Amino acid sequence: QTVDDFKNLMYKMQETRRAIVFALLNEKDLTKDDVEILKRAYEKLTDNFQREMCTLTTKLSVNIGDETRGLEKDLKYLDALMNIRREEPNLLWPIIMSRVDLFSILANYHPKGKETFLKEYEDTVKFLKTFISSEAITGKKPIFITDWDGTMKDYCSQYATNLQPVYSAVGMTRFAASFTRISAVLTAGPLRGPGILDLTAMPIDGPVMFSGSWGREWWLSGKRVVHQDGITDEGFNALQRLDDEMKDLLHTSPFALVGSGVQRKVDRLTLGVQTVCHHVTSELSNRYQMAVKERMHNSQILVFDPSTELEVEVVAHNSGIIWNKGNGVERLIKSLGDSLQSPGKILICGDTLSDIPMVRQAVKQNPDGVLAIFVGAKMSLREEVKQVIGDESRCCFVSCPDVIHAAMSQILNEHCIG
Ligand SMILES: [Mg+2]
């Protein structure tokens, strides 16, 4: 019921998720002990309606809705898999996957009604098909770049338990390996704990290449490369030191675990001090913020600022060119043997305004030539992506990531399995 039991539960489970996905991609067998770990995390997360956790001196309510639905979906998926696997025990996983109706499983959970899901799905399939066709045209597989939060994954109320379900990890890995010469993922958060490498159910050294800090740090092929590109070397190491006195401090009661939960990025520390609506007892919020400037010591080079109600940042500029996702993308593609310039298609998937520099970059290099799936936002954003490219026949708007997941799964069933 406590914090560390929540964290530890979610993380051991997530590691198990990774193992399951491994079994599922590599043709190994699926232990019912694994699945059962999943099952138990699920049935605890619903017992005593969304649940609250505690230390000693503090207690806080936490929305576990995403964690729950993640687990739930995964369980009905995996069940379908295993009962088709129980015989024939040697049937290739992908074929079994083509027998499992993922569409109906995901086309329960969502904001519109079903028929919307259906049609967005149909459209998205069609779209993706056009992309694949790129490779029949140019004799090179195309490039795939995607945002994570909101885009490949539903939003989670807290960053630490933001956890990728199995089905999406599988579909994504398969899609990327089969259809693409490059698949990059750009996130705002850091790489490891708790970064996106820890949050993912996916291979990480395979066909998908994961980044964080908006492209400032990548995981490849086996290590982590980090582009500072700002004055200094000073408070890169200081941000490291501060992030330390923070590891130091969450020992105490307080709770790491709120909206973004103390992320160390390359250029900055970004910190949840408060939630929506109001939780975390504004007194304790204030005391902890001054624990934050406590640790912040010269007056050390780095600078505070209350970005918002709920969040806050410790920033290191000097310096910057003001790095965005476009730059992350370009740095990546150039680092490899490649270019967005090449003839063929680029598919980009995004959710907020932050993904637009990525489209700008893409069309700058390849105007013919770029595809975008955005999820699911307002007239303004829809209109903006329509703007930053041409038609509008190259734009696809869907309301949730599961539409993309189902479409991909379909495309895999059709082109891979026949
Ligand atoms: Mg996002």
Author numbering: 63 to 110, 115 to 319, 323 to 366, 371 to 491
Sentences from the paper on this structure:
The structure of B. malayi T6PP bound to Mg2+ was determined at 3.0 Å resolution (residues 63–491). Electron density was not observed for residues 1–62 and SDS-PAGE analysis of dissolved crystals revealed that this region was not lost during crystallization. Thus, we conclude that residues 1–62 are probably disordered and are not required for stability or catalytic activity. A single magnesium ion is observed to be coordinated in the active site by two waters and four residues (Motif I: Asp213, Asp215 (mainchain C = O oxygen), Motif IV: Asp424 and Asp428). In B. malayi T6PP, the cap was found to be in an open orientation relative to the core, though the crystal contacts were consistent with stabilization of the protein in this conformation and the protein may exist in alternate conformations in solution. Notably, the B. malayi T6PP has a slightly more open conformation than the orthologous T. acidophilum enzyme. The MIT-like domain is tethered to the core domain by a helical-connector (residues 158–206) that is comprised of a broken α-helix (helices 4 and 5), which interacts with both domains and a second, longer α-helix (helix 6), which selectively interacts with the core domain. In T6PP, an intramolecular interaction occurs at the interface between the first and third α-helices of the MIT-like domain and the C1-loop of the HAD core domain, leaving the solvent-exposed interface between the second and third helices free to make intermolecular interactions with other proteins. Although the cap-open, unliganded form was observed in the structure, site-directed mutagenesis coupled with substrate and inhibition kinetics identified five residues important for catalysis and/or substrate affinity. Notably, no single residue is critical to binding, consistent with a mode of binding of the trehalose moiety by van der Waals contacts and shape complementarity between the sugar and enzyme.
